[PDB]
Amino acid sequence: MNLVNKAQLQKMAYVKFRIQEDEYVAILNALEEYHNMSESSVVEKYLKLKDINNLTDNYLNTYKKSGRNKALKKFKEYLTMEVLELKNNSLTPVEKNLHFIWIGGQINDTAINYINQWKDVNSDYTVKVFYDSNAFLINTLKKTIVESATNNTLESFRENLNDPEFDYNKFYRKRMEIIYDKQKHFIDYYKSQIEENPEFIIDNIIKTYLSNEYSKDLEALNKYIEESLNKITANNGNDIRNLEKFADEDLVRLYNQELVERWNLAAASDILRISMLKEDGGVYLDVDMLPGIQPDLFKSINKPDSITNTSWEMIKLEAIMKYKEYIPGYTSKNFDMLDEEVQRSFESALSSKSDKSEIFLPLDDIKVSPLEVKIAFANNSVINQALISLKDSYCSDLVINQIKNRYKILNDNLNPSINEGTDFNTTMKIFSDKLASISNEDNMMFMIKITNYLKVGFAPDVRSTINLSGPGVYTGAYQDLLMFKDNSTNIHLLEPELRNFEFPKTKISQLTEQEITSLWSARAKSQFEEYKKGYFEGA
Numbered sequence: 334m335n336l337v338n339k340a341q342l343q344k345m346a347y348v349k350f351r352i353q354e355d356e357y358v359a360i361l362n363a364l365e366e367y368h369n370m371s372e373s374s375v376v377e378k379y380l381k382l383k384d385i386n387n388l389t390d391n392y393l394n395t396y397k398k399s400g401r402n403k404a405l406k407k408f409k410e411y412l413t414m415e416v417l418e419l420k421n422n423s424l425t426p427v428e429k430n431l432h433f434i435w436i437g438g439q440i441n442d443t444a445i446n447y448i449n450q451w452k453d454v455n456s457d458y459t460v461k462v463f464y465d466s467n468a469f470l471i472n473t474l475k476k477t478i479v480e481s482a483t484n485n486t487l488e489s490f491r492e493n494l495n496d497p498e499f500d501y502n503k504f505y506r507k508r509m510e511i512i513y514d515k516q517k518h519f520i521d522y523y524k525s526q527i528e529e530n531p532e533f534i535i536d537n538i539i540k541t542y543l544s545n546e547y548s549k550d551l552e553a554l555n556k557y558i559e560e561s562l563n564k565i566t567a568n569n570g571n572d573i574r575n576l577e578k579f580a581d582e583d584l585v586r587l588y589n590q591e592l593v594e595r596w597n598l599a600a601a602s603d604i605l606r607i608s609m610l611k612e613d614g615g616v617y618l619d620v621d622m623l624p625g626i627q628p629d630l631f632k633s634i635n636k637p638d639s640i641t642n643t644s645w646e647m648i649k650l651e652a653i654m655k656y657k658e659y660i661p662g663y664t665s666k667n668f669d670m671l672d673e674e675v676q677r678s679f680e681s682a683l684s685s686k687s688d689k690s691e692i693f694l695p696l697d698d699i700k701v702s703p704l705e706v707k708i709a710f711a712n713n714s715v716i717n718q719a720l721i722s723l724k725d726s727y728c729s730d731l732v733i734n735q736i737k738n739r740y741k742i743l744n745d746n747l748n749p750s751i752n753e754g755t756d757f758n759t760t761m762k763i764f765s766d767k768l769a770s771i772s773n774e775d776n777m778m779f780m781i782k783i784t785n786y787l788k789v790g791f792a793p794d795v796r797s798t799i800n801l802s803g804p805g806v807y808t809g810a811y812q813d814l815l816m817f818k819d820n821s822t823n824i825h826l827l828e829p830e831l832r833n834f835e836f837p838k839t840k841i842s843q844l845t846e847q848e849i850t851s852l853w854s855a856r857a858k859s860q861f862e863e864y865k866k867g868y869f870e871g872a
């Protein structure tokens with residue numbers, strides 16, 4: 334998998350009596366100087382490969398009928414193989430920072446109890462729980478707007494509870510039409526304030542607004558902020574509102590968009606995570622991930638043949654939490670189904686184990702190439718609940734670029750749509766019709782998936798988020814990397830190519846109680862029934 338020589342490339346692409354064309358010369362020259370760059374940085378070696386790839390399709394575009402074309406197409410696959418070789422031979426241990434993010438409200442003790450498992454076993458890592466000291470009321474504002482929209486939708490459904498078919502479908506449709514209004518009433522208010530005084534703090538705009546419109550208690554809100562601040566402070570809280578240079582001015586604008594306007598804490602955390610990884614380097618994790626388990630802790634408890642690999646992984650953590658009680662409250666539902674005998678095999682293993690570092694596996698030295706961002710996989714697909722990146726790695730810039738290029742398209746089309754439109758449905762139509770008119774084979778899927786942006790968090794099955802700041806931007810980045818592009822939106826990467834970027838398996842346990850709980854954010858008819866219930870179950 335060593336890249337072909339200029340010499341050998343001449344053999345591949347040889348056509349008897351054919352003139353050495355200027356564009357073919359360029360290729361050969363470039364490839365020769367690549368083999369002359371051993372002392373160069375890996376990024377500089379990658380950029381030399383990239384250049385060569387651009388020279389090759391410029392030949393293939395200039396001479397569409399050339400006899401060289403078949404080998405030149407092969408050659409381009411070797412360039413891509415070559416990226417992998419660079420990446421595998423440039424491994425170096427990540428900055429030992431461990432990142433979590435909790436924004437928009439008070440951290441739960443659940444979050445704290447998981448994080449602690451990581452902190453307790455990674456003493457050589459700096460744990461940093463990123464929070465936004467200006468934005469503790471985001472979940473409150475949201476819960477309030479959503480609460481108000483709900484109770485207004487039910488008032489309108491009041492006598493029609495039993496028939497014909499005012500079901501969950503129509504509830505969310507109509508509630509959404511109301512949420513949009515209330516959300517746009519706040520955004521317009523927040524915007525006006527920010528044009529008035531730009532030193533104005535988010536939470537201060539939100540309390541002023543809750544107090545007037547939703548009759549929310551100023552005192553209580555200030556109290557709430559004080560508790561949030563104090564709690565994260567005590568728990569390695571790192572305020573993003575101190576940190577200077579990390580700030581891409583466009584990413585900052587996207588973060589705020591997702592935080593203050595869209596109230597989507599997941600999206601802003603998507604944006605925040607990669608930005609901090611680019612600025613700080615390290616391992617990023619969602620607060621619902623726990624450390625991996627020592628390989629040997631359980632290595633002689635043979636899995637009963639009937640139970641799945643997934644359950645078993647889930648069982649092992651529950652065994653850990655039954656017998657060590659590290660996280661109080663942690664479930665044993667699955668564990669307690671096993672034969673008493675196996676349960677005791679688990680108990681035994683956990684008896685001769687003194688400290689937590691003999692139970693979980695410490696990150697220690699994780700290596701990564703400047704060319705990559707490692708990512709977790711769930712169910713054969715990438716998932717960005719766990720990431721690894723050197724500071725200022727080439728792949729974190731590909732990711733950030735992807736986020737910027739996607740949002741530009743979203744914003745360029747959605748802002749004009751919001752402006753013109755009496756209501757939600759009117760705006761959505763304007764927006765879809767806008768998205769349709771610039772859509773093509775390449776970006777069609779993307780357009781489809783971000784069409785429902787305005788419903789994210791407010792209705793089920795929306796996927797906009799995935800395609801702007803989540804898993805899609807990473808496969809977009811990985812394809813950019815391997816295919817020497819800067820615009821991948823139509824992804825032809827397969828699982829085993831993408832496995833080249835997998836977060837090391839033994840060093841994370843994804844199958845925690847909280848995670849599995851968060852995989853049920855399928856459909857809830859049960860909510861429109863519980864909101865129904867909140868109207869005969871009361872005063």
Ligand SMILES: O=c1ccn([C@@H]2O[C@H](COP(=O)(O)OP(=O)(O)O[C@H]3O[C@H](CO)[C@@H](O)[C@H](O)[C@H]3O)[C@@H](O)[C@H]2O)c(=O)[nH]1
Pocket residue numbers: 433434435436437438472598599600602603618619620621716717718719798799802803851852854
């Ligand atoms: O009030 C909140 C809620 C979420 N988060 C952040 O979002 C992360 C993911 O939250 P989670 O409850 O796990 O939501 P999911 O929908 O299960 O998250 C999935 O989808 C998101 C895509 O936006 C990604 O951020 C996650 O990595 C991915 O696991 C958390 O760790 C937090 O950093 C907050 O900061 N505040």
Ligand SMILES: [Ca+2]
Pocket residue numbers: 619621718847848851852
């Ligand atoms: Ca989750």
